[PDB]
Design a protein around this ligand. Structure first.
Ligand code: HAS
Ligand code: HEM
Ligand SMILES: CCCCCCCC/C=C\CCCCCCCC(=O)OC[C@H](O)CO
Ligand SMILES: CCCCCCCC/C=C\CCCCCCCC(=O)OC[C@H](O)CO
Ligand SMILES: CCCCCCCC/C=C\CCCCCCCC(=O)OC[C@H](O)CO
Ligand SMILES: CCCCCCCC/C=C\CCCCCCCC(=O)OC[C@H](O)CO
Ligand SMILES: CCCCCCCC/C=C\CCCCCCCC(=O)OC[C@H](O)CO
Ligand SMILES: CCCCCCCC/C=C\CCCCCCCC(=O)OC[C@H](O)CO
Ligand SMILES: CCCCCCCC/C=C\CCCCCCCC(=O)OC[C@H](O)CO
Ligand SMILES: CCCCCCCC/C=C\CCCCCCCC(=O)OC[C@H](O)CO
Ligand SMILES: CCCCCCCC/C=C\CCCCCCCC(=O)OC[C@H](O)CO
Ligand SMILES: CCCCCCCC/C=C\CCCCCCCC(=O)OC[C@H](O)CO
Ligand SMILES: CCCCCCCC/C=C\CCCCCCCC(=O)OC[C@H](O)CO
Ligand SMILES: CCCCCCCC/C=C\CCCCCCCC(=O)OC[C@H](O)CO
Ligand SMILES: CCCCCCCC/C=C\CCCCCCCC(=O)OC[C@H](O)CO
Ligand code: CUA
Ligand SMILES: [Cu+2]
Lengths: 167, 554, 31
């Protein structure tokens, strides 16, 4: 009858919707897996735990001299040691060549910061005592702004840096 | 009243609801000022003349997040998911424990509130170390949240007293929802309890010198995902079991409602790395595993969409609506208890779509920590959950107090829910669009007025929303106090039954309900999924602790 | 048949697809 007809017809269509639903979610998983097998995957932070002492990173080791923070580690590869701190980035600016693989190694001497490079997929949290490692290749020369996008205290809204990508 | 001697659970429920709506009012006063800020308009000089204890944008944002997303939502969950099962079973909760629950929540709130008002815990509702708040904040928040463990016991007690008196009977539908809701929350709560007892409390008291921020975030987001299902499920309970009656219809399936709730018990907790896609020192394989489980936790809401839609269509046809769209106009759009949750469900369509993008691992690098994320979650908690809670006052407050709602109060209610809904949709456009233009969340951007020139158009939307939602808030305050400070009482409305829906039954129903009634089995499975999803990363992290000093940067 | 409920899940499905393919496109443009 009409309530029992309704109920049978409602459940029949709900079974199809649920099968379509799973099919769609499975296609999204396939399209995500594809991103993991391309160069676009370098913006995923390294899983390795790489521990540092935030109390000495400004006095000893590769963050202590910002003018020597850009190191050639490969024939078309540079590693950049970046400090995010209350309230700025060192070095400033970061100067790198177009077309090279850049390995950013970012740490904090104080609180958590963001490292978000406007126009790119570089978007990583920076934890004191830990190194966040991301890689990217800049295809276009010019100036790219670094935005701090994790609340770090009262100076947060003014915490900006600069990458200059040279031809 | 003779009412409260027979049904004292009515007065305890009322104390939860009112304390929650007071928290919502105070938290929401900061909302319009934050929307004006995301429109490049600095109104904080004016707010500081009216509330001179406010020292900063970020102290306001801390009060906003804590009072709206932690305090209001918890106290609503505690009111609905203890009272509705009690009334369905026609049984009295342990009133000693129910009053204890309330006093824990009230004392936790007062203790946490003190350092928040005095500018000693401007760390936001996520309180990520090494930003170091006052010990009273962590202690107060700890006690507030643990009040829910008493809630859990009260409902498990109700269920086992009913089962002992009805051997061989299946759990009734509302009590079933509340049981798997409270068992889910027990598992969910353990991350934050562990973060508080092992780390934040001893650190805050000066008994350890530092905390490992990667450990703290990992334990936080154990609780931090499922707390949003904790906010949602009491709204879903009303939308499944009460809204169909208010629409003029019936719930079309008891089993597909139970199954949605069972999938939330299983899939709500083991998902938290979707908040940690951009964190160092978590293996990308585990991030992919959490992103797949996150896509699965969407399924019970995709199912809810179909079950609810089919039940509203049924009600509309029974009320004489014809064709593909005439069922919509036949629904009772004059009844605020109907309109509020339905507008909430409409905004939840784009809200849910944003959630699925956020879950998809590498796509999160586009949106993480931008204005996109507040755009997403205002459609989920600030619209669906809050509008459902506002609508429930049209049937729940007469049922607890015997105070009637005038025709004039009804019409004012309709204006409030329409303006709240429209303001949230307008703000959603502004924040999603600003987010795609790289505008950060959690930022006093009105203090750097030339930094985001590309966002001038979406900023106009955020100004409009701020004004519309300011008006909605003032009308809501006036309406709520007109009903609570009204002198007229009619005790036969306090004795009336709750408007529970009837269900359409089918031959299938009995065999699927008894498999889902094996609650001990399904709880075991949910617990095992948490161990597998978290255990291997936590042994990694705890093996390699790197605690760091605390900072005050405000 | 629940034709009204079908029209609702059609609009839900199109919203999900527009959101998801739109952001997928942005991710590769920024990549
Ligand atoms: C109540 C509160 C919330 C709900 C519900 C919610 C749902 C989801 N979320 Fe979320 N969320 C994320 C993923 C999801 C996913 C996959 C879902 C899913 O559960 C959503 C599924 C929903 C659906 C698939 C919608 C179904 C539609 C329905 C049911 C409506 C039907 C309409 C009808 C029937 C009306 C018809 C009637 C007529 C009359 C026509 C992710 C990542 O994966 C992040 C981190 C992002 C980052 O980078 O920080 C995130 C961030 C947040 C934050 C910020 C935390 C912070 O401060 O950092 C909050 C507060 C929040 C709340 C909530 N969120 N979320
Ligand atoms: C009049 C109502 C409201 C308006 C105009 C509004 C506006 C805003 C805005 C613009 C933000 C973003 C601020 C930023 O990122 O710097 C925000 C944050 C937030 N809002 Fe609302 N809001 C309102 C009501 C609510 C309600 C009802 C809830 C929850 C039930 C809520 C929960 C939140 C949360 C959790 C945050 C994030 C806090 C954080 O990042 O630490 N809001 N609100
Ligand atoms: C690009 C995509 C565009 C969006 C796609 C639309 C949404 C998908 C599926 C809706 C549900 C489909 C329902 C099919 C099941 C039919 C069925 O089983 O009905 C037989 C029944 O027995 C007769 O009474
Ligand atoms: C009944 C029908 C059954 C079968 C239906 C299956 C649907 C297939 C869906 C997705 C294709 C996945 C292919 C992935 C290719 C991605 C290519 C891409 O996105 O390329 C742009 C980018 O520039 C590259 O670097
Ligand atoms: C600090 C502790 C205050 C302890 C509070 C002691 C008073 C509790 C009385 C009680 O049971 O209150 C329930 C309710 O207020 C009845 O209307
Ligand atoms: C409501 C919940 C209240 C819980 C309080 C736990 C407080 C923690 C106290 C436990 C003692 C820890 C301690 O002092 O640890 C010393 C440590 O060895 C130095 O390295
Ligand atoms: C009610 C319970 C009160 C706990 C009383 C505890 C009293 C706490 C005093 C010690 C204190 O505040 O120490 C802070 C520390 O020195 C810097 O992190
Ligand atoms: C139900 C449970 C679901 C289980 C199946 C999930 C797929 C498993 C592993 C893929 C992870 C691959 C991660 C590799 C990324 C590394 C990378 O790209 O490094 C930069
Ligand atoms: C633009 C910004 C977005 C606003 C969206 C609103 C959609 C609301 C859809 C639901 C409205 C139904 C109203 C209705 O049918 O009302 C009947 C009336 O009472 C006479 O019969
Ligand atoms: C053109 C765009 C301009 C910007 C928008 C302006 C803002 C708000 C307008 C006021 C809207 C108030 C709507 C009230 C609707 C209402 O109460 O409808 C009751 C009806 O019975 C169904 O439930
Ligand atoms: C509606 C808002 C839509 C605005 C979308 C902005 C487009 C965008 O993000 O630009 C693409 C990419 O960033 C540049 O290569
Ligand atoms: C209806 C109300 C507003 C619609 C939206 C109006 C948006 C018009 C743009 C306003 C604006 O700010 O102009 C951008 C730009 O700065 C110009 O020089
Ligand atoms: C109608 C909406 C009212 C919004 C009016 C204020 C919008 C705004 O701030 O516009 C500034 C303008 O774009 C630069 O001078
Ligand atoms: C203290 C809160 C009590 C937490 C209760 C969860 C453990 C428990 O009793 O679960 C067994 C399951 O309910 C089998 O019926
Ligand atoms: C009312 C509810 C809230 C409303 C939410 C507003 C945002 C809607 C959709 C976002 C989809 C992404 C839009 C970006 C499209 C870009 C595109 O199509 O890509 C072209 C190009 O390749 C790129 O660089
Ligand atoms: Cu550094 Cu915000
Ligand atoms: Cu989550």
């Amino acid at each position: 009858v009409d309530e029992h007809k309704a109920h049978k017809a409602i459940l029949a269509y709900e079974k199809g919707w649920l099968a379509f639903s799973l099919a769609m979610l499975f296609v999204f998983i396939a399209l995500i897996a594809y991103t993991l097998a391309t160069h676009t995957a370098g913006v995923i932070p390294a899983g390795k735990l790489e521990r540092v002492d935030p109390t000495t990173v400004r006095q000893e080791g590769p963050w202590a001299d910002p003018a020597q923070a850009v190191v050639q580690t490969g024939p078309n590869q540079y590693t950049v040691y970046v400090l995010a701190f209350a309230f700025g980035y060192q070095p400033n600016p970061i100067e790198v060549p177009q077309g090279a693989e850049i390995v950013f190694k970012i740490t904090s001497p104080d609180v958590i910061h963001g490292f978000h490079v406007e126009g790119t997929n570089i978007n990583v949290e920076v934890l004191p005592g830990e190194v966040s490692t991301v890689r990217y290749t800049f295809k276009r020369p010019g100036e790219y702004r670094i935005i701090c996008n994790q609340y770090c205290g009262l100076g947060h809204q003014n915490m900006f840096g600069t990458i200059v990508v040279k031809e | 009243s003779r009412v409260y001697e027979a049904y004292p659970e009515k007065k305890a429920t009322l104390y939860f609801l009112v304390l929650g709506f007071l928290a919502l009012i105070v938290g929401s006063l900061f909302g319009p000022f934050q929307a004006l800020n995301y429109g490049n308009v600095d109104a904080y000089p004016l707010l500081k003349r009216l509330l001179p204890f406010v020292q900063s944008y970020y102290q306001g944002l801390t009060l906003h997040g804590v009072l709206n997303a932690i305090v209001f939502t918890q106290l609503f969950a505690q009111a609905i998911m203890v009272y509705l099962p009690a009334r369905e079973l026609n049984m009295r909760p342990n009133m000693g424990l129910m009053w204890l629950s309330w006093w824990m929540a009230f004392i936790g709130l007062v203790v946490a509130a003190l350092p928040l008002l005095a500018n000693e815990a401007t760390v936001l509702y996520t309180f990520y170390p090494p930003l170091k708040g006052h010990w009273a904040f962590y202690l107060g928040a700890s006690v507030f949240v643990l009040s829910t463990w008493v809630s859990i016991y009260i409902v498990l007690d109700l269920w086992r007293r009913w089962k002992a008196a009805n051997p061989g009977k299946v759990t009734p539908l509302v009590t079933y929802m509340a049981v798997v809701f409270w068992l889910m929350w027990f598992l969910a709560s353990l991350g934050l309890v562990l973060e508080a007892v092992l780390f934040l409390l001893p650190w805050s008291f000066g008994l350890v010198e530092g905390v490992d921020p990667l450990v703290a975030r990992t334990l936080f987001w154990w609780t931090g995902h499922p707390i949003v299902y904790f906010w949602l499920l009491p709204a879903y309970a009303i939308i499944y079991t009460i809204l169909p009656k208010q629409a003029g219809g019936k719930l079309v399936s008891d089993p597909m409602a139970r199954l949605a709730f069972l999938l939330f018990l299983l899939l709500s907790t083991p998902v938290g790395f979707h908040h940690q896609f951009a964190d160092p020192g978590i293996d990308p394989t585990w991030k992919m595993i959490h992103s797949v489980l996150t896509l699965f936790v969407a399924v019970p809401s995709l199912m809810t969409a179909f079950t609810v839609a089919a039940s509203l269509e049924f009600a509309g046809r029974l009320r004489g609506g014809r064709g593909l769209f005439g069922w919509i106009r036949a629904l009772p759009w004059d009844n605020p208890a109907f309109v509020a949750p339905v507008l909430g469900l409409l905004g939840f369509i784009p809200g849910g779509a944003g959630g699925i993008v956020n879950a998809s691992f590498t796509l999160d690098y586009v949106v993480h920590n931008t204005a996109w994320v507040p755009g997403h979650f205002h459609l989920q908690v600030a619209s669906l959950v809050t509008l459902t809670a506002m609508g429930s006052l049209y049937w729940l407050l007469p049922n607890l107090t015997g105070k009637p709602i005038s025709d004039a109060q009804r019409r004012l209610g309709l204006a409030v829910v329409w303006l709240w809904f429209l303001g949230m949709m307008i703000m959603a456009v502004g924040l999603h669009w600003a987010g795609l233009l790289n505008v950060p969340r959690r930022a006093y951007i009105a203090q750097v007025p030339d930094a985001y020139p590309h966002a001038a158009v979406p900023m106009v939307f955020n100004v409009l929303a701020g004004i519309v939602l300011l008006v909605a808030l003032l009308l809501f305050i006036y309406g709520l106090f007109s009903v609570l400070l009204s002198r007229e009482r009619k005790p036969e409305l306090a004795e009336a039954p709750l408007p529970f829906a009837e269900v359409i039954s089918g031959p299938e129903d009995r065999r699927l309900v008894l498999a889902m009634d094996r609650i001990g089995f399904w709880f075991a499975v949910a617990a095992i999924l948490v161990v597998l999803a978290y255990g291997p990363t936590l042994v990694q992290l705890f093996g390699h602790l790197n605690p760091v000093p605390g900072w005050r940067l405000w | 048949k629940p034709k009204g409920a079908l029209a609702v899940i059609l609009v839900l499905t199109l919203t999900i697809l527009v959101f998801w393919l739109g952001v997928y496109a942005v991710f590769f443009a920024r990549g």
